[PDB]
Amino acid sequence: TLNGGITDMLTELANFEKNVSQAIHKYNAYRKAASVIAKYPHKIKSGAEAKKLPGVGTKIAEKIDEFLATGKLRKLEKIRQDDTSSSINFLTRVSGIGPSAARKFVDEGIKTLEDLRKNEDKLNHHQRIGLKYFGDFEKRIPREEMLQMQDIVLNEVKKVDSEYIATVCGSFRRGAESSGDMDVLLTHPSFTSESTKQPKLLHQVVEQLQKVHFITDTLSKGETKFMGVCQLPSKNDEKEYPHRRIDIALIPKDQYYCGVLYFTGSDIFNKNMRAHALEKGFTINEYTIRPLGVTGVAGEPLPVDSEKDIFDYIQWKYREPKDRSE
DNA sequence: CCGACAGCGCATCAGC
DNA sequence: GCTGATGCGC
DNA sequence: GTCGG
Ligand SMILES: O=c1ccn([C@H]2C[C@H](O)[C@@H](COP(=O)(O)NP(=O)(O)OP(=O)(O)O)O2)c(=O)[nH]1
Ligand SMILES: [Cl-]
Ligand SMILES: [Cl-]
Ligand SMILES: [Cl-]
Ligand SMILES: [Cl-]
Ligand SMILES: [Cl-]
Ligand SMILES: [Cl-]
Ligand SMILES: [Mg+2]
Ligand SMILES: [Mg+2]
Ligand code: NA
Ligand code: NA
What we know:
It contains 16 helices and eleven strands. The chain is α+β, with helices and mostly antiparallel strands. It folds into four domains: 4-82, DNA polymerase, domain 1 (Orthogonal Bundle), CATH 1.10.150; 83-139, DNA polymerase, domain 1; 140-262, 2-Layer Sandwich (Beta Polymerase, domain 2), CATH 3.30.460.10; 263-325, Beta Polymerase, domain 3. It has a five-stranded mixed beta sheet, sandwiched between helices. It binds three DNA strands through helix 2, helix 4, helix 7, strand 7 and helix 15.
C-alpha cells in the first residue's frame, strides 16, 4: 500500500465513470492505472514518475500531482457533494442494480436503503436478494472461513458423484487472506466439448448444496453458470455467519485448464493476458485458445494440457496464481 | 489522429 | 414462441 | 483515459 492514497483516488474515479457517467472505457482506463501503480515498488513522488508506467497518461499524471500536493482531488470533492452522483453511486452497491437501474430509481426518487426497502415490489429477483443481504455482501470472507466453505462444497459434491471435480478459484486460489466471495469451478467426465452425456450436471450439485442448507438463495442459474448465496452453519448459541456470494461454473472437462485460468483471474490479469494474446495473434476465452486468421477469424482450438501451455503460446513466462493478483 | 480497448453466461425486454 | 439487443455481473 | 502505429 505504498501508494494507497493514489490508487484509492483512481478507483473512486473509475467508479464514478462506470456508475454515473456510464463511460465504460474511462472506468477501465482508471482501473488499469490503479493496478499498474498498485504493483509499482516505490512510493510515487510525482505525476511524471507515474506517467512512466503504462496506462498512466497526461490526465492521471496531473491528478496525481494535485493529489500529492494537497492530499485531495477537487474533482472528487465536487462529485462527493453532488446528490445525484452520490445517490447513483450508492444504489449501484446493491447486487443487481447497475448504472442504468440506479439512475432510473433516482428518477423515481428511490435513492436510499430505506426507499429500496419500501419499494421491494419494484425490484427484480436478483435486486431483492442483493437488498436482503446488502450488509453481508459488503463484508469480506476470512480465508479460514473460505477453507471451511471449501470443505463443505468439495465433500457435498463428492457425495453427489465421486467423478466430479470441484476447484475453488478466484482470489482464494491466488492465495488471498480474504475474499469477496467464493468461486467454484466444476467438471464431470460426462460433460466435454465433444458431448453432454448427462443432463442437470450443475443442477444436481446446486440441489445437494441447497438440501444441506449451504446454498440459501439464487441470483441466476443456467446449465453452466450458477450465481447465488451460501452460508456456513454456525454452532450452538453461536451468532450466525454472514451470508456469502457464491458462483459456480461448469466447464467441459477437456477444457479444464483454460477454465481454471479464467476463473483464477484476477479480472485485470485476464484482461492484460487476453490483450497480449491478441497482440501475439491468439484469442483466449474460458474454453479455448485459438489462433486468429489473417482476416481476424478465430481458428481451431490449440492443444492445452496445462495452464503453462497457455502462457507458452503467447510467449509469457509462467505466473503462479499468487502472482496474478492485478 | 483514431480505432480499439477480453470475452462471455443468464435475466429481461422489444419486436415479430 | 423465437431471435436479437441491453443490463448486470463473472 | 491511454496507447500503438
Ligand atoms: O470482469 C471479470 C470479472 C471476473 N473475471 C474472472 C477472473 C476472476 O478472478 C474470477 C472470479 O470473479 P470475482 O468477481 O469473484 N473476482 P475474484 O475472485 O478474483 O476476487 P474477489 O471475489 O475476492 O472480489 O472470474 C473475469 O475474467 N472478468
Ligand atoms: Cl468511455
Ligand atoms: Cl479526493
Ligand atoms: Cl466531474
Ligand atoms: Cl479447491
Ligand atoms: Cl471457444
Ligand atoms: Cl500460487
Ligand atoms: Mg471471487
Ligand atoms: Mg465470483
Ligand atoms: Na504512461
Ligand atoms: Na450493483
